[PDB]
Design a protein around this ligand. Structure first.
Ligand code: CLA
Ligand code: CLA
Ligand code: CLA
Ligand code: CLA
Ligand code: CLA
Ligand code: CLA
Ligand code: CLA
Ligand code: CLA
Ligand SMILES: CC(/C=C/C=C(C)/C=C/[C@@]12O[C@]1(C)C[C@@H](O)CC2(C)C)=C\C=C\C=C(C)\C=C\C=C(C)\C=C\[C@@]12O[C@]1(C)C[C@@H](O)CC2(C)C
Ligand SMILES: CC1=C(/C=C/C(C)=C/C=C/C(C)=C/C=C/C=C(C)/C=C/C=C(C)/C=C/C2=C(C)CCCC2(C)C)C(C)(C)CCC1
Ligand SMILES: CC1=C(C/C=C(\C)CCC[C@H](C)CCC[C@H](C)CCCC(C)C)C(=O)c2ccccc2C1=O
Lengths: 41, 75, 74, 160, 735, 180, 120
């Protein structure tokens, strides 16, 4: 698991993981607080 | 693209449709392929413009994704 | 990859489809095998395909193929 | 008020839009049966539509003659939650991203194989830099003061 | 295979068809011709200018003659709001009986006139088909004058020298004062003498003009200084144009706004405008020094303008010799000024219609705006292209540099990377966010929840409208307020006319704007910035870059530098023009789409259709293009045809030319040379055709020629299809 | 550079107070786009003198009730400018002309890039011999007192503006100037 | 976590006078108190963070020069810790109590979320 972790450190895998996480928290914010046109405050 | 356009228009105009109980055949477009598919203006108007009505009027309906993909594919 | 794709198609037919309703009314129910999650207002994509079902109408003809195979249950 | 607009809480066309959307959703709801998941989904749609319209009404939002919320982005703090606060939020987040990217580029740029560490990210160092971007406004106005933010004449120029 | 490119021996020795193609495309590049001097260059340019002005005057004379002969000008005078102007008659042997019947107007098939010449000539005081004939005769005489002058100034004793051509001060004094001021003075004279009484029913022709006083007091107030007398008793609010009912006696007034009947600017307003412009330009034409010891030497003015702290380098010291010795710098400046000027014409002739009954001529309004905006884009791209040409072939770094320090122009090549980077940043910023908001509106509306749209009220632009007096946005700012010093100052001069016109829903003066206007203006800004980015990058990088640090040694237009160094496709400055032409066409298309849709909704009355559907792309596609294309495509159907049949044919023709351009742009050479070789073998190896052989070896079009041909097809198809669409849609929708 | 300039005292340690390093941005990238320290110091002196004068001009007329005879009796600085602009236009015009002449004679435009014949707030202007003959340290101390009083007046005027805009921003203000 | 656990136990017991400070439940007190008191705590904690670490606040900036014992702010006014013999025991006790308080702070917060009344 020394080269597998290095493989997971490559640009495509890291970008895919980061974009999946990013889309995930964006989608979940929009699920829990939907239809947010202005700042909540 | 020309092949699938020919298939779509010919089928809609001269095969597909409904049959009345007495045996009268009414097609989706109404047989306009025979007389209006012989000019480029006919293809532009009676096929592209005419059958693109459902795509452009799909907003707000369950087919709105098709309009969005229409616009995105144009883009 | 092809086998995984086919397995996904059959799984969607089994779980997220109105295949049982379409079997009893092939001429009046539109085949649907993909339901859309209710996020950002995208749930409008779940169409009135019939058979007490909401989802995207399927144009791949899997329902007809499954019926021709004799598959009568999900 | 501003630009001839009126608050959406007193906009008749806004309420007409809400009523029409609710009526369409209820008409769709009529064609399903009992407490079946389709009816539950349509009822949730109706509830969310009502909640969204109510929130937009009670949000200091100005509606035009079409009954849609218009954004007042001239800079006034009265409508500051429409553009100004999201503007600050995005500026913070994007400055964070740019700062951590620049810091990672400059950090692995002083190693033996700078190009290797760009396709194969040093995840420990990347995590170290990324969580340090919360001070990007302060770090930027501490590196610009020291002259470490801008190159001067080692930058390359074309022939003319 | 010889003697055609007389100006180029290198081309005349080409054994292929490329010689003929390049002979056409290099005929006007006089600086590159064989056995070339500067004196011959300026003399040939001078004669070509004379021939060009003759061509322009002949074209105007032809328009006048064809309106006089085959038009319905006289009938249109008596009923300008119902009679449709006729451009010229049609005689085409290919017409069927149906086409003849549909195009039949009065006595012969004819084309409606969309140039607005009827309204323009009616406004300036033409009431007879014999007045137009006189104008055509006079213009042909003027064309003969200009052709004679062009021939004369190539004769040995009448060919001007370089000193005369480069005499900047004399030419500026004369151009400004004489041309602008005196032509404005003569136009004011005509306006008053002929146009003012003709709008009041009094005919002032070439017979009773020495005896018909333009004003009852007759030049007495002018010499006496009682200039207010020319403004007393203006035309009333019940004046019928071309008739004495409700008319006045004033000739120079401030009224502001429009005529209550013709919905156009007051003739007395325009006469006063031209008189003021004439006085100002005649005064300004005495600035520069000539043979009488007073005036300015512009070399000294340019050299003395260096900021003392020092931020522009050494200033403008080397600019005088730079501009004087370069014809591409001057051409670029002139083209930029002309582009801005014609953009101004387009933007003002719709908001402030100057000709009688032109506001109600919707097809001609749309045609005029589209024509002038396209000409504006062309002129701007030409200005930038000639700036790039100046950089390539006329710029001298030594002249623009004094002791290491660089002047104001040479410093533009030092921070060229900064300029290009910031243009790129602005373009990316605007594109990203305009497209993001548009697609957000698309998705949100498509999902059936239009309330979640992002609609930004254009408060900055509405602020300007309120400043000019529009009481629609409740700003109460400068002229929307009756107590502000801006309003009290002109409350007695031109506000009552101006306010009555700006605060009117039927005008195009300061059209009401909303979020759709905001988004489309940002799209326009993105288009302008991207076209400017391409053109400025090509101009600054014309002399070299990192990929080609000797690009100046290869000229303005060359195909490439080869596949080496990673590939150098489209690396020349000409290729930057070629790429920016697409962006200019796209930007002008956006501008004209916005204008035409806004005015179609305004004229039809459904301005709510634009205000709601213009915020998302599908709104545009469905409600402008798809909606208004219905009358055009039904110009001929399997059932019949209309007078709009020619417009549908032009629509399809434009699409075809556009796609042929796509041919010439996507498919490159090399693929067409081998095919041509196969065709050559086939011709050479076939009997009964071996008897016929080519003199020029058939070869594929060159890379640059192919780019030009594809661009020409793209542009011609673009222009033709949009002209057909706009005209046919306006005609078929608004009656 | 700030170590050898008047302006820092015991209130901020012994070092020149400059959290944002604004005094050292002039030497940074660019020929000149950010002000030199000389321009910043001249802005110090000008703003401080103006703030002291404005504090006197909001306190004396508004509170003490002292008014020039033929001038509006408006104890409010948010309306006094316009009221005098209408009531005595000639006086305001002459004040503006005097201000313009004074500033044009004492132009500080070469201070932006650093340099010039004048010093920071030199202005001559010593009628009543307060610095006739003094030690250099005494003159520096007087300059420091002037700068600190100018900063205090800046703060007081900003507090006035803040309380007028956001009520309750300065708590003791209305209890320390009981009249408007 | 230790300070926050003590805050829970005191808040449900003692509380402050006033309508705002009248919620025995910490989770509901976070909402009833409003944003103004919380933002002041946020800004004060930020001021503390800045002054205690003396500018170097990030993972790459802190410990860049070394000479910084982890967790050593020098805070010891009462003088507990002069004897080095008990210093190690005090450090271990602080670490163990901190870990236990992290677990307990999570426990209390989630108890308030699933029940809603209080901790008791
Ligand atoms: C990577 C980003 C991310 C983040 C921060 C969250 C965050 C959350 N998810 Mg979650 N989720 C994600 C991606 C993510 N999800 C993805 C990619 C899927 C699969 C499509 C899910 C499927 C999912 C389900 C099925 C549930 C959550 C739930 C939750 C919440 C409690 C755990 C929390 C707000 C739970 C929740 O709050 O629902 C009550 C829950 O039941 N998530
Ligand atoms: C680039 C321009 C642009 C902008 C400014 C917006 C802005 C917005 N869109 Mg939008 N959109 C865009 C492009 C854009 N979009 C495009 C190109 C599409 C097509 C894919 C969409 C499709 C789209 C949909 C389908 C929806 C939106 C929605 C929204 C709104 C809610 C945003 C949100 O989730 O905030 C909440 C999330 C955040 C603020 C994330 C940041 C939180 C971090 C973690 C804070 C942490 C630091 C402290 C917001 C007004 C939603 C809405 O309600 O509209 C009103 C909605 O349903 N948009
Ligand atoms: C009074 C004497 C006089 C007059 C009338 C002219 C007139 C002319 N000369 Mg000329 N010339 C003169 C003296 C004069 N010259 C002298 C003394 C010299 C020697 C120093 C020259 C040397 C010279 C050369 C070398 C050339 C000319 C050319 C021309 C012609 C220009 C093309 C044309 O038709 O423009 C017509 C233009 C107008 C009628 C007016 C244009 C209106 C503009 C576009 C509107 C601008 C309004 C406003 C500013 C817009 C901006 C908005 C604002 C808010 C900023 C024109 C006929 C050129 C030509 O074509 O030769 C045949 C040419 O090559 N001249
Ligand atoms: C002290 C000497 C003097 C003075 C004060 C005047 C004053 C005047 N002359 Mg005058 N004049 C003079 C000597 C003088 N003249 C001489 C020596 C001659 C030749 C012998 C003339 C020939 C002359 C003529 C021919 C006319 C005047 C006119 C006028 C009047 C028109 C001014 C005006 O409105 O500008 C008008 C402004 C412009 C034309 C452009 C600016 C003005 C009162 C005019 C008039 O009608 O007076 C009632 C007129 O037509 N003058
Ligand atoms: C008054 C304005 C003006 C003037 C004097 C010039 C003058 C010049 N330009 Mg220039 N240019 C202008 C405007 C102007 N241009 C504008 C507005 C643009 C932007 C479009 C350009 C873009 C441009 C480029 C890119 C280049 C020049 C070049 C040149 C030089 C040689 C021209 C040549 O060889 O012609 C050759 C003429 C042709 C090839 C004829 C082309 C005709 C086109 C394709 C239209 C014909 C089709 C027609 C519409 C048919 C209708 C179809 C039907 C079905 C409807 C010459 C100094 C060239 C040079 O080397 O400069 C040093 C060069 O490379 N110019
Ligand atoms: C619909 C077609 C289309 C689109 C979207 C673009 C988009 C762009 N072109 Mg472009 N171009 C096109 C057709 C198009 N072009 C054609 C047909 C030509 C003729 C050959 C050119 C010639 C051309 C030149 C010569 C230049 C550009 C430039 C640009 C950029 C301008 C900055 C901008 O808007 O950033 C915003 C970008 C977008 C809105 C599009 C991409 C965003 C996507 C949707 C993100 C999706 C993420 C998942 C941008 C990437 C300029 C450039 O590079 O500027 C920096 C430039 O110099 N283009
Ligand atoms: C007009 C506002 C202004 C400006 C331009 C300055 C400028 C200066 N001050 Mg200063 N100061 C001010 C107001 C101002 N101060 C006020 C109101 C106080 C009282 C709290 C002080 C207290 C103060 C002390 C105690 C010291 C200085 C010092 C300095 C000098 C070095 C710091 C620097 O470059 O700041 C540049 C400042 C600006 C460009 C102003 C930007 C302000 C922005 C808009 C934010 C303002 C709102 C928060 C410089 C000449 C130091 C000095 O003299 O060094 C020898 C020093 O020791 N000042
Ligand atoms: C273009 C603007 C401009 C320029 C270049 C000058 C230049 C000069 N002025 Mg001056 N001045 C101006 C406007 C201008 N003035 C205005 C509007 C007034 C008020 C009525 C004055 C009042 C004035 C006085 C009282 C004195 C000078 C003096 C001077 C001279 C040297 C001292 C100095 O600069 O300090 C004075 C500096 C200023 C007054 C600052 C003016 C700043 C201007 C308003 C900013 C304009 C820049 C802006 C970007 C322009 C926009 C361009 C375009 C968009 C329209 C110098 C020749 C002195 C002199 O005569 O020396 C013997 C002197 O005693 N000026
Ligand atoms: C602190 C915590 C959560 C705290 C939440 C807070 C403050 C929330 C505040 C808010 O909600 C409110 C109040 C209102 C909201 O609107 C806003 C916010 C602000 C969001 C969770 C901890 C959660 C802590 C957890 C889950 C700990 C799990 C520990 C495990 C599993 C340990 C296992 C072991 O210990 C054993 C068993 C044996 C050992 O030998 C080996 C190991 C393996 C180490
Ligand atoms: C490349 C090059 C070139 C070219 C360039 C170009 C082409 C440019 C363009 C340019 C342009 C195209 C510019 C534009 C400009 C504009 C402007 C500058 C404007 C201004 C305006 C104003 C200023 C206004 C104002 C106002 C207002 C706003 C309101 C009303 C009133 C008033 C008037 C006040 C050349 C050849 C030279 C040389 C070489 C290089
Ligand atoms: C189609 C095509 C061709 C082939 C087209 C050619 C060779 C033009 C064929 C001749 C045209 C149709 C004009 C024919 C005119 C008549 C022969 C009359 C003669 C007129 C001359 C005397 C001017 C290329 O050579 C080429 C080169 C580089 C990139 C793309 C392409 C490309 O797309």
């Amino acid at each position: 698991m020394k080269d597998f972790l290095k493989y997971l450190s490559t640009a495509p895998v890291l970008l895919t993981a980061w974009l999946t996480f990013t889309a995930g928290f964006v989608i979940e914010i929009n699920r829990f607080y939907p239809d947010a046109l202005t700042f909540p405050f | 693209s020309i092949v699938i356009f020919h298939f779509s228009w010919k089928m809609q105009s001269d095969v597909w449709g409904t049959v009345s109980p007495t045996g009268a055949v009414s097609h989706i477009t109404g047989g306009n392929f025979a007389q209006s598919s012989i000019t480029i203006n006919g293809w532009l108007r009676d096929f592209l413009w005419s059958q693109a009505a459902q795509v452009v009027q799909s907003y707000g309906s369950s087919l709105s994704a098709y309009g969005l993909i229409f616009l995105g594919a144009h883009f | 990859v092809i086998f995984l794709w086919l397995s996904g198609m059959h799984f969607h037919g089994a779980y997220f489809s109105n295949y049982s309703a379409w079997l009893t009314n092939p001429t009046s129910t539109k085949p649907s095998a993909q339901i859309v999650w209710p996020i950002v207002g995208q749930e409008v994509l779940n169409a009135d395909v019939g058979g007490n079902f909401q989802g995207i109408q399927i144009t791949s003809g899997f329902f007809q193929l499954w019926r021709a195979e004799g598959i009568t249950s999900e | 008020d501003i630009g001839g607009l009126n608050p959406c809480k007193d906009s008749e066309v806004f309420q007409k839009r809400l009523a029409k959307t609710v009526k369409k959703l209820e008409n769709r709801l009529k064609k399903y049966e009992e407490g079946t998941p389709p009816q539950i989904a349509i009822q949730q749609q109706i509830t969310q539509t009502k909640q969204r319209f109510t929130r937009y009404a009670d949000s200091n939002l100005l509606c035009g003659n079409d009954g849609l919320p218009h954004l007042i982005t001239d800079g006034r703090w009265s409508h500051g939650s429409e553009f100004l606060l999201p503007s600050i939020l995005f500026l913070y987040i994007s400055g964070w991203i740019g700062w951590v990217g620049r810091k990672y580029i400059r950090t692995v740029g002083q190693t033996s194989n700078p190009t290797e560490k760009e396709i194969i990210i040093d995840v420990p160092l990347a995590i170290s830099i990324m969580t340090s971007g919360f001070l990007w406004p302060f770090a930027a106005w501490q590196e610009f003061l020291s002259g470490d933010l801008i190159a001067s004449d080692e930058t390359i120029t074309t022939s003319p | 295979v010889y003697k055609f490119p007389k100006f180029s021996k290198a081309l005349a020795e080409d054994p292929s068809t490329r010689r003929i193609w390049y002979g056409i495309a290099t005929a006007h590049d006089f600086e590159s011709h064989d056995a070339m001097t500067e004196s011959k260059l300026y003399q040939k340019i001078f004669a070509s200018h004379f021939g060009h002005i003759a061509i322009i005057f002949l074209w105007t004379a032809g328009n006048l003659f064809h309106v006089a002969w085959q038009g319905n000008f006289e009938a249109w005078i008596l009923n300008p709001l119902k009679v449709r102007p006729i451009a010229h008659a049609i005689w085409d042997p290919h017409f069927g009986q149906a086409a003849y019947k549909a195009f039949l107007k009065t006595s012969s098939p004819a084309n409606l006139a969309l140039s607005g010449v009827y309204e323009w000539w009616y406004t300036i005081g033409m009431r007879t088909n014999n007045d137009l004939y006189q104008g055509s005769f006079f213009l042909i005489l003027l064309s003969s004058l200009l052709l004679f002058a062009g021939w004369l100034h190539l004769q040995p004793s009448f060919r001007p020298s370089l000193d005369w051509f480069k005499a900047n001060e004399y030419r500026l004094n004369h151009h400004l004062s004489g041309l602008f001021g005196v032509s404005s003075l003569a136009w004011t004279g005509h306006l008053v003498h002929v146009a003012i009484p003709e709008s009041r029913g009094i005919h002032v022709g070439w017979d009773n003009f020495l005896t018909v006083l333009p004003h009852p007091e007759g030049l007495t107030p002018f010499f006496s200084g009682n200039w207010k007398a020319y403004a007393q008793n203006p035309d009333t609010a019940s004046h019928i144009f071309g008739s004495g009912e409700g008319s006045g006696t004033a000739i120079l007034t401030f009224l502001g706004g429009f005529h209550p009947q013709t919905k156009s600017l007051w003739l007395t307003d325009m006469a006063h405008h031209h008189l003021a412009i004439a006085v100002l330009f005649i005064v300004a034409g005495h600035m520069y020094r000539t043979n009488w010891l007073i005036g300015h030497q512009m070399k000294l003015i340019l050299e003395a303008h260096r900021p003392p702290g020092g931020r522009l380098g050494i200033g403008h010291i080397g600019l005088y010799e730079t501009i004087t010795n370069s014809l591409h710098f001057q051409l670029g400046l002139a083209l930029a000024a002309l582009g801005v000027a014609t953009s101004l014409t387009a933007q003002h002739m719709y908001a402030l219609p100057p000709y009688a009954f032109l506001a109600s001529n919707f097809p001609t309004q749309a045609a005029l705006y589209t024509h002038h905006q396209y000409i504006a884009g062309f002129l701007m791209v030409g200005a930038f292209a000639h700036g790039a040409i100046f950089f390539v072939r006329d710029y001298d770094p030594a002249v623009n540099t004094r002791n290491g320090e660089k002047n104001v122009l040479a410093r533009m090549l030092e921070h060229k990377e900064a300029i290009i980077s910031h243009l790129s940043w602005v373009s990316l910023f605007l594109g990203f966010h305009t497209l993001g908001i548009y697609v957000h509106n698309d998705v949100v509306v498509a999902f059936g929840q239009p309330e979640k749209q992002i609609l930004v009220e254009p408060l900055f632009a509405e602020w300007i409208q309120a400043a000019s007096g529009k009481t629609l946005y409740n700003f109460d700012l400068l002229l929307a307020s009756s107590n502000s010093p801006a309003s009290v100052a002109s409350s007695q001069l031109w506000l009552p006319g101006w306010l009555s016109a700006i605060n009117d829903g039927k005008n195009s003066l300061f059209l009401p704007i909303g979020p759709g206007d905001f988004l489309v203006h940002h799209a326009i800004a993105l288009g302008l910035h991207t076209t400017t980015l391409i053109l400025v990058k090509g101009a600054l990088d014309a002399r070299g870059s990192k990929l080609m640090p000797d690009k100046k040694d290869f000229g303005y237009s060359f195909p490439c530098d080869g596949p080496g160094r990673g590939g150098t496709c489209d690396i020349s400055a000409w290729d930057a023009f070629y790429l920016a032409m697409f962006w200019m066409l796209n930007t002008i298309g956006w501008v004209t789409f916005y204008w035409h849709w806004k005015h179609l909704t305004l004229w039809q009355g459904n301005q709510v259709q634009f205000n709601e559907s213009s915020n998302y792309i599908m709104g545009w596609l469905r409600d402008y293009l798809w909606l208004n294309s219905s009358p055009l495509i039904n110009g001929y159907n399997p059932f019949g045809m209309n007078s709009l049949s020619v417009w549908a044919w032009m629509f399809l023709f434009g699409h075809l030319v556009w796609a042929t351009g796509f041919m010439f742009l996507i498919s490159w050479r090399g693929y067409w040379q081998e095919l041509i070789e196969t065709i050559v073998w086939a011709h050479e190896r076939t009997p009964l055709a071996n008897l016929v052989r080519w003199k020029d070896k058939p070869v594929a079009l060159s890379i640059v020629q192919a780019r030009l041909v594809g661009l020409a097809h793209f542009t011609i198809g673009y222009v033709l299809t949009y002209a057909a669409f706009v005209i046919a849609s306006t005609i078929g929708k608004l009656g | 550079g700030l170590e050898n300039q008047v302006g820092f005292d015991i209130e901020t340690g012994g070092k020149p107070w400059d959290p944002f390093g604004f005094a050292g941005v002039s030497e940074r990238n660019g020929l000149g786009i950010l002000p030199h320290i000389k321009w910043l110091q001249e802005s110090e002196i000008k703003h401080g003198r103006t703030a002291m004068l404005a504090f006197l001009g909001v306190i004396v007329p508004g509170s003490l009730g002292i008014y020039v005879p033929t001038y509006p009796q408006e104890p409010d600085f948010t309306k006094a400018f316009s009221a005098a602009l209408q009531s005595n236009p000639l006086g305001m015009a002459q004040i503006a002309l005097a201000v313009a002449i004074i500033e044009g004679h004492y132009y500080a435009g070469d201070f932006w890039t650093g340099g010039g014949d004048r010093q920071v707030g030199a202005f001559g202007f010593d009628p009543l011999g307060f610095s006739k003959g003094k030690s250099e340290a005494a003159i520096k101390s007087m300059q420091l007192k002037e700068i600190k009083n100018g900063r205090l007046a800046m703060i007081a005027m900003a507090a006035f503006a803040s309380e007028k805009f956001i009520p309750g921003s300065v708590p003791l203000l209305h209890s320390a100037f009981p009249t408007l | 976590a230790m300070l926050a656990f003590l805050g829970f136990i005191v808040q449900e017991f003692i509380r402050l006078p006033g309508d705002l400070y009248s919620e025995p439940n910490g989770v509901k007190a976070f909402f009833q108190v409003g944003p103004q008191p919380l933002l002041q705590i946020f800004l004060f904690c930020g001021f503390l963070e800045f002054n205690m670490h003396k500018g170097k606040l990030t993972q790459v900036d802190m410990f860049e020069d070394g000479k910084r014992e982890p967790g050593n702010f020098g805070f010891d006014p009462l003088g507990f810790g002069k004897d080095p013999a008990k210093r190690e025991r005090y450090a271990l006790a602080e670490l163990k109590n901190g870990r236990l308080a992290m677990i307990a702070i999570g426990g209390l917060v989630h108890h308030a979320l699933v029940t809603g009344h209080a901790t008791f």
